[PDB]
Each structure stands twice: as C-alpha cells, then as structure tokens.
Design a protein around this ligand. Structure first.
Ligand code: BEF
Ligand code: BEF
Ligand SMILES: [Mg+2]
Ligand SMILES: [Mg+2]
Ligand code: NA
Ligand code: NA
Lengths: 196, 188
C-alpha cells in the first residue's frame, strides 16, 4: 500500500538475490519481483506497475537501457545500478529519463536512501559520473591514445591489431570507447560554448 | 558455534549486500569486509577467521595472490568470482582454496557451500563443467521474429514493414544473427 514496491533486474544471480534480501528488510519497501533480463523488467513493469525498478545495464536478451526506453512513460521510476561508468551508457540513460544512475562501487547501505530520494522526486546520479564526465580534459586512456595514433596515421583495423599484438574485435571495441568518449566530450563542449 | 567470515570483494555494492545476506544466518557472522587482496592478507593474518570469501579480480593484489600468501594459515578460502577461467581455477587449487564458486549461481546456495567447506569438503561449481555443453539457442525473441520472416521469403523492405522498425535495424539484426549462428556453428 504505502510501501515502495520494487522490481530488480540483474543478470548476476548472487547480486540479484542479495539486493532483494537487503531491500526487503526495509520497513517502507517491498521487493515485489526479480528478473535477469531487460524483457523480465518490461513484462513485470507493464503488468504490475511497481513504483521503482532497480535496473542493471548489461543483461542477456535485452539490456537495462533498451528496457528503460520501452518503459519511458510508464510512471515507473527507473534507477540504473551498473558496474559501467561509460559516457554512452550515461548519455543513453538520461535520454530514457531514468530517475537514478548508480554505480556498483558505492555503499550498499545507501541504495535504500537513493530509492527514497527518487520517490521524493529527486534525480540521483553517482557524483563520480559528474566528477569524471563533466570535463573539457582528454578522456582517452594511454591504451586508447595508442589505438587512435595508428588510426590517425591511416592504418586499417587489420594493421592496428598487428602493430599492437591484440585481437581484431578488441581494436573495434577500443574504437567504440573512443567514439563514445569523444562524442560526449564534443556534445558537452558544443552546448556549454553555445550558451555563452 | 559461529562460523566467522571475512569477505574480500572490490565491488562495494556486492560486498555490502553479501555481508548482510550471510549475517542473516544463525550460525554465521561476517567479522570483516575488504576491497583488495591486501585487506584479506592483513585481516586473515591478524584475526584468523574460519572462512574467507574471496573475489579474484581486485585492485592492488588479486584474490589468487592473497590465497597464495595465506597458503599456510588455517583459514578456509572460498573463491567467489565472475570468472570461470581454467587458469584461475588451477591457480586457486594449487594455492589450496577449499571452494571455487561463481557469482552467477543462486545466492541461497552460498551459506550451504560455507557449511560444507567448514565440514572439510572441496566445493567447486558444477557449472564450470556443465556450461561447456550448455548447447543453447543464442538468438533473442526479437532475432527469432526477424529470422521467421527471412525464412518465409520476405525481403528487407517487407520485414521492416511487418515489424514496424527501420531498414538499417533489420540489417543490424541480420548481421548479429549471422555472427551468433556462425560462432554456434563453428563450436558445433
Ligand atoms: F551488467 Be550491469 F550493467 F552492471
Ligand atoms: F572480480 Be571477482 F573475480 F568477480
Ligand atoms: Mg549485468
Ligand atoms: Mg572483482
Ligand atoms: Na519490507
Ligand atoms: Na548471524
């Protein structure tokens, strides 16, 4: 009734179960359902309409971000809880209108407080995302700077994989991180320099 | 009596939630928590708990390097990891760990593994061997809907209309379907 009804979507069964127990122990909270894929979240949320959905990003079948996009206007308050502090993930979560974006490297004893704040109409982001992403500095790592150096010289995916002694899919994965990091840094710059 | 447990896990969310889960058991007490292998080495050497739930991948010092330094203490080391790598498994058992568990197993079967290890048993996740023969369909429900139309004899324009999605999305779904089936076919 007055309790905050929660659904948890998490593919790692150990964390899913431990989060469910932790949250259920709260007097004002009830874990009404648990799932391991984004489809489990879409199905539950559409059928049962819980107040809150604690959502992992990387899950099989359908991600937490695709699930957040499908549930954009349901009235369910989506709190992303992920290992990944990637700009593309955070940007995609903001566009889906998530109420919260939390990192798995934050105290467990604070999660219930984030749920209460989101129920109070607040938008809760891990300060670390802000501390790392909201910057005009170079976001690229030393490894990413080595990949891009070769790309800028005019070398193809096969040539970069040979020069760095790594797999062809790894070069493509590194390029995806670079494009994402620079696309967010470029959008941040563009918006803040146009507001002047 | 009570089984005293130390948990070494770099992901603060799991560390805290595992601690709370284990502490609910009547015969168990989480006496300490750490985020690196050094925290495990220091706690275990100073306090000598019965059991150490040990993550592998942690900054500074891994759970495997920690297990190697603790090899001659009376602590029962249980590896709890995301990684089902043979290299990790062999390194652990050579270090004398009593258990090697996977994080993708029911939380409700951790307490039982701790009790078995305290009873002198070696607990290794059956999944380590079973997941090799986990010959399952990699295609999603969405991918199964795309392929159903392709097999009927419908073109890219016809599939995009029947599913109400973009033409490039149909091509993206196909390129994914080919990749997943090519790897499943090579594994076969
Ligand atoms: F796999 Be979840 F994005 F941490
Ligand atoms: F980082 Be632990 F090996 F899951
Ligand atoms: Mg996940
Ligand atoms: Mg780890
Ligand atoms: Na409750
Ligand atoms: Na207890």
């Amino acid at each position: 009734g007055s309790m905050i009804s929660i659904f948890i979507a998490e593919d790692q069964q150990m964390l899913l179960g431990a989060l469910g127990s932790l949250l259920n122990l709260e007097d004002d909270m009830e874990v009404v359902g648990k799932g391991t894929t984004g489809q489990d979240a879409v199905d539950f949320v559409k059928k049962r309409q819980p107040d809150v959905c604690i959502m992992d990003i990387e899950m099989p079948g359908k991600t937490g971000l695709e699930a957040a996009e499908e549930l954009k206007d349901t009235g369910c308050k989506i709190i992303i809880l992920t290992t990944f502090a990637r700009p593309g993930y955070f940007q995609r979560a903001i566009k889906a209108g998530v109420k919260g974006y939390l990192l798995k490297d934050s105290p467990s004893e604070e999660l219930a407080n984030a749920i209460r704040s989101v129920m109070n109409g607040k938008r809760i982001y891990a300060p670390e995302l802000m501390e790392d992403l909201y910057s005009e500095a170079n976001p690229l790592t030393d490894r990413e700077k080595e990949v891009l150096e070769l790309v800028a010289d005019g070398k193809n995916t096969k040539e970069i994989a040979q020069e760095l002694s790594i797999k062809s899919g790894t070069v493509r994965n590194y390029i995806s991180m670079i494009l994402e990091k620079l696309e967010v840094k470029n959008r941040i710059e563009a918006i803040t320099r146009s507001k002047e």
